[PDB]
Swiss-Prot record, chains A, B:
It comes from the Viruses. The active site is at H41, C145. Residues 1-304 form the Peptidase C30 domain. Residues 1-304 are cytoplasmic. The gene is rep. The chain holds residues 3264 to 3567 of 7096 of the full protein. Changing N142A: Does not affect ability to cleave and inactivate human TRMT1. It catalyses: TSAVLQ-|-SGFRK-NH2 and SGVTFQ-|-GKFKK the two peptides corresponding to the two self-cleavage sites of the SARS 3C-like proteinase are the two most reactive peptide substrates. The enzyme exhibits a strong preference for substrates containing Gln at P1 position and Leu at P2 position. Inhibited by pyridone-containing alpha-ketoamides compounds 13a and 13b. In turn, alpha-ketoamide 13b (tert-butyl (1-((S)-1-(((S)-4-(benzylamino)-3,4-dioxo-1-((S)-2-oxopyrrolidin-3-yl)butan-2-yl)amino)-3-cyclopropyl-1-oxopropan-2-yl)-2-oxo-1,2-dihydropyridin-3-yl)carbamate) inhibits SARS-CoV-2 replication in human lung cells. Inhibited ex vivo by michael acceptor inhibitor N3. Inhibited ex vivo by compound 11a and 11b. It is found in: Host cytoplasm; Host Golgi apparatus; Host nucleus. This is 3C-like proteinase nsp5. Changing C145A: Complete loss of 3C-like proteinase nsp5 cleavage. Changing K90R: In strain: Beta/B.1.351.
Length: 304, 304
């Protein structure tokens, strides 16, 4: 019993972290096989970040200008190329600690773990969600760029995020491992406002199921609703619309608890309309949306 | 910017996890050097747990009855001994992945990361606090016993907890790595009620400092208080009494923000007396107490 914001074990990713320095800028790189992946803004000074022409800045850079250090040993750079907003530095040595991996581009609402690093060294691990406005609410200081987000399925690491930017609002933006930013964000120090940060409804429902499994049941009511009625309430409270795809994904949780998805939606509707009245659910005083239905099943069954 | 419930990178601990089986019971073990540490209740059936005589049960066990598997390979057991509530199984092979380590017995209010494991395999990592009633609010299912709590200082892992029990209330109890339980708990399936779960006041203050650093300042007020006045309020709300030792530990946070500790206590006093009024602090609708002053400094400075 018990339910925690759990991150994936980070060891497989720790073995991939390296430090990349170009000129006076140092950030983190991801070493998989004989390629080091890092944000292209490693070639920028803070002044360049105001209005960078990455193609023009990259011309003035040769292989020997990219210093890559794994632990206390230097990797030899034998090629470099820019793919969207990431640089791929070909090194002469395959990373012996390379795990089985995939590059995946996640959808908003999906969760992942972040291994925060500085100077190629891991500082901590935490669980995040890609917000519906394509930002992440992370914990990143200067030098954390190049830290990555990932998911693990038995022995396969699916890298989904690479940290690049902090918006003026203190929220974070980055790319998938192909260098394409999530959302409309660009690797430029300019006004980039985020859109409405809506609540991930399917995740809140999954967390309510996790609460029922773990004993927190005070919020269960005698009511039911319909998808259209629930969605009128969801729109009012800046919750994402719930679809039949979401109901289907909640099927195993509905079956395990015996609570029909629409009955759980009716409990959620009352929690939105009446609030928690000073009560808590799984140790939280707000409706948690950073657990997917898959996370709840995984945690509640002990998948390793 | 941003503040997250961050766990230590778990790689160094992942390399120590093994599966231990004795008869029909399987749990996790910690392999450091040529010793495997695991809960002594590995020798129990669920029936034995009702009223176990560990010395008598252990007599019927020989080295060959303890099956230790690291990954997919079997470790040879050449000795066994019981130290308090843990078994120490001497193996013929030193763990090549043994990190620099120490065994530490933490105080209530101290935080640590837990690497939840099943069958010797890591499932996830999360950050915990030893509650003032010596329980932890974890996420542990059957087979999670032997999972460990730890802290890391650069390259040294300080193991502080080993999971043993789930109390009938769904909270968790365990030992330090010498096998001594935290609190009055015993490794027996019997009525073990926990005492009052008070709030770790020094940690809440540290988290309020973290909020100020990160931009959440609405709760700062025009008031101050004294340690005795604050403590009258703390007692009323089941908060731990604040001492001059706690004020001293909050000194660096007080200096960085320019907010005197007693002024922050006065903001906390008003938050206790008036509530949050539907507002949030660092994305939480309740006062968070699982960040020590050391955790706040570490996270806010990027210690690797
Ligand atoms: C190195 C890095 O990730 N930066 C952001 C640091 C934080 N706090 O996320 C760096 C990239 C361009 S930037 O102007 O956002 C500063
Ligand atoms: C294997 C283990 O840790 N147990 C507890 C499982 C949970 N949910 O923490 C196991 C040890 C004795 S017990 O009766 O608590 C069951």
């Amino acid at each position: 019993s018990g339910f925690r914001k759990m991150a994936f074990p980070s060891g497989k990713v720790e073995g991939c972290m390296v430090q990349v320095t170009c000129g006076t800028t140092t950030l983190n790189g991801l070493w998989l096989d004989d390629v080091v992946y890092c944000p292209r803004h490693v070639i920028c000074t803070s002044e360049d970040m105001l209005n960078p022409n990455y193609e023009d800045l990259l011309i003035r850079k040769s292989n020997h200008n990219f210093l890559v250090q794994a632990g206390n040993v230097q990797l030899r750079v034998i090629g470099h190329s820019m793919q969207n907003c990431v640089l791929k530095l070909k090194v002469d040595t395959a990373n012996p600690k390379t795990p089985k991996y995939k590059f995946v581009r996640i959808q908003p609402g999906q969760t992942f773990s972040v291994l925060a690093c500085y100077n190629g060294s891991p500082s901590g691990v935490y669980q995040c969600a890609m917000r519906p406005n394509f930002t992440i609410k992370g914990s990143f200081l200067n030098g954390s760029c190049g830290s990555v987000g990932f998911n693990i399925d038995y022995d396969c690491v699916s890298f989904c995020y690479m940290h690049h930017m902090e918006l003026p609002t203190g929220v974070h933006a980055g790319t998938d491992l192909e260098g394409n930013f999530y959302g409309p964000f660009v690797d430029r120090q300019t006004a980039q406002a985020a859109g409405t940060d809506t609540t991930i409804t399917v995740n809140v429902l999954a967390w309510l199921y996790a609460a029922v499994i773990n004993g927190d049941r005070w919020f269960l009511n005698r009511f039911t609703t319909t998808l259209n009625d629930f969605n009128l309430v969801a729109m009012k409270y800046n919750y994402e619309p719930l679809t039949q795809d979401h109901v289907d994904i909640l099927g195993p949780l509905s079956a395990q608890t015996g609570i029909a998805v629409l009955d759980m939606c009716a409990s959620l509707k009352e929690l939105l309309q009446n609030g928690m009245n000073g009560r808590t659910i799984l140790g939280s005083a707000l409706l948690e949306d950073e657990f997917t239905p898959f996370d709840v099943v995984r945690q509640c069954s002990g998948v390793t």
